Each structure stands twice: as structure tokens, then as C-alpha cells.
Amino acid sequence: HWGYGKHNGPEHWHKDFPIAKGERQSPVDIDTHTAKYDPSLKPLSVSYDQATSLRILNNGHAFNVEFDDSQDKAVLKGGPLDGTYRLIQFHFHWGSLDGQGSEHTVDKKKYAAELHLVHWNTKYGDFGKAVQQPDGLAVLGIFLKVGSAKPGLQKVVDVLDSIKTKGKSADFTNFDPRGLLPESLDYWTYPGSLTTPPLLECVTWIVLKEPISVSSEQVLKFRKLNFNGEGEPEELMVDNWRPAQPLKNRQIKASFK
Numbered sequence: 001h002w003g004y005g006k007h008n009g010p011e012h013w014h015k016d017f018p019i020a021k022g023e024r025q026s027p028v029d030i031d032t033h034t035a036k037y038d039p040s041l042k043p044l045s046v047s048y049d050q051a052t053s054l055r056i057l058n059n060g061h062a063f064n065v066e067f068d069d070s071q072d073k074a075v076l077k078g079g080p081l082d083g084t085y086r087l088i089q090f091h092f093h094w095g096s097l098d099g100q101g102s103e104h105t106v107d108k109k110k111y112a113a114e115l116h117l118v119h120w121n122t123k124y125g126d127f128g129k130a131v132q133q134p135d136g137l138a139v140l141g142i143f144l145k146v147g148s149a150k151p152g153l154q155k156v157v158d159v160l161d162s163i164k165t166k167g168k169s170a171d172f173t174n175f176d177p178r179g180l181l182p183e184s185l186d187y188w189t190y191p192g193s194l195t196t197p198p199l200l201e202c203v204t205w206i207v208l209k210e211p212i213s214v215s216s217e218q219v220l221k222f223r224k225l226n227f228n229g230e231g232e233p234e235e236l237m238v239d240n241w242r243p244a245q246p247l248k249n250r251q252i253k254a255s256f257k
């Protein structure tokens with residue numbers, strides 16, 4: 001099955017998921033000089049005050065912090081979006097070393113990690129229906145660089161020992177994702193896809209310009225996770241990022257000048 005190794009990694013995914021070579025695949029390199037300021041873009045509206053986190057899951061490719069999305073509690077609106085998108089989960093992509101790990105790049109710069117807050121368009125009723133639509137999901141992408149610790153991340157880091165291997169989960173209530181956001185909500189946006197199989201072309205990407213800083217110790221703990229199941233040969237969960245894909249017939253728009 002698919003993963004991030006030599007034998008089953010991003011260069012192989014097209015054989016099971018032909019849309020991998022599609023017209024609006026993610027991630028992409030963000031050429032900052034070519035992205036055009038769009039004065040018609042709105043400020044993002046990130047309304048996470050009532051967010052209800054439930055659980056954290058090692059799914060064999062990342063860890064997902066899952067939210068109660070049975071009603072409008074944590075929503076993303078505004079920016080490039082029409083309507084209301086409900087937070088369902090967040091996860092990260094990261095490297096084996098600090099010089100790689102992000103999926104999006106900025107003028108070819110790779111960050112140490114990238115956070116994805118996944119939201120679905122509530123006009124489609126459920127997540128499974130939303131992923132079948134071109135405007136089904138909105139993913140808020142936030143770059144991580146290694147420097148000062150991020151205090152709001154440490155509750156996540158400290159639970160990781162309990163979900164070391166694929167299929168392990170743990171209770172993870174009352175986590176506030178507002179503690180993972182940078183100061184500025186300046187962003188780039190473009191139409192794209194899921195960055196893992198099934199690679200569905202259902203995502204409005206909103207990538208924040210300002211990275212968050214996390215400590216070397218924090219990201220080292222991400223790298224102690226396992227792709228494998230309990231008792232299986234240990235494969236460290238590192239380099240779980242898809243590289244940049246062809247931009248093709250797309251424009252990246254900036255919310256700022």
C-alpha cells in the first residue's frame with residue numbers, strides 16, 4: 001500500500017491514483033514574486049473559540065487531532081471562500097532533518113514542518129460528500145521553523161509517546177488550536193488537492209505567510225513516531241511530505257502587499 005518510502009512513495013502514487021498527474025495537484029512551490037496581490041480577497045475569519053477536540057490518532061502516515069464536527073463549533077470563513085467550512089482535523093508533515101518537511105515551499109525554501117487544519121464545506125452536509133466537490137474542503141496551511149518553542153504545541157508533543165505506532169489513538173480533549181496560529185493571517189491561496197491519496201481535487205488552499213516557531217526538542221519528538229504498527233519493524237515516521245507538483249494552469253493569489 002502507499003506510503004513515503006522508495007518503493008511506495010509519492011513517485012508511485014499515480015499507479016493507484018491517476019489523478020496524481022492531474023491539473024490541480026498539491027502541494028506547489030509558491031513563487032512570491034509571481035503571486036499577485038488580490039485586493040478583492042477578504043481577511044480570513046478563523047473562529048475557533050468553541051472548538052471541541054476529541055482524540056489523537058496515529059494513522060500510519062501522520063497523526064490526526066480530531067474534532068467534533070457535528071455542528072458549527074470551529075469554522076473557517078472569508079478569505080477566498082464562499083460559505084462556511086467546519087474544522088474536522090489537523091495534522092502535520094515533517095522531515096528527518098530541519099531542512100525539509102514542508103509540502104508547500106516558498107521560493108523553493110522547504111520549512112521543517114507544515115501544519116494542515118482541514119475544514120469541510122457545510123453546504124455538502126458531510127465530509128465524505130464534500131471531498132467529491134471542487135470546493136469541498138479548505139485547508140489552512142502553516143509553516144513550522146525550528147527556533148523558540150511553541151507553548152501551544154507542547155500538549156500535542158507530550159501525548160505522542162502514547163500513539164507511537166499505526167492504529168493507536170488517545171483521548172485528546174480540550175485542546176485549543178488557536179495556540180498554533182502565527183500573529184498574522186496574511187496568506188496565499190490557490191485551487192488544489194489533497195496531498196495524500198486519494199489526491200482528490202477538492203481543496204481551496206490557504207497558506208499563511210508567517211511561519212510559527214517550534215523548538216528542536218518539539219520536532220524531535222514528532223520524529224520518534226512510527227509508520228509501522230505495534231511490534232513490526234520500526235520505521236520512523238519522518239519525511240511524510242509530498243514534494244511540489246506542477247502549477248499548470250493556476251494562479252496563486254496573495255492577500256497582502
Ligand SMILES: NS(=O)(=O)c1ccc(C(=O)O)c(S(=O)(=O)NCCc2ccccc2)c1
Nearest residue numbers: 064116118128131139193194195196197198
Ligand atoms: N494534507 S491534506 O490536508 O490534504 C490531508 C492529509 C490527510 C488526510 C487524512 O485522511 O487524514 C486529510 S483528510 O482528513 O481530508 N482526509 C482525506 C482522505 C479521505 C477521503 C475520503 C474519506 C475519508 C478520508 C487531508
Ligand SMILES: [Zn+2]
Nearest residue numbers: 092093116195
Ligand atoms: Zn496534510
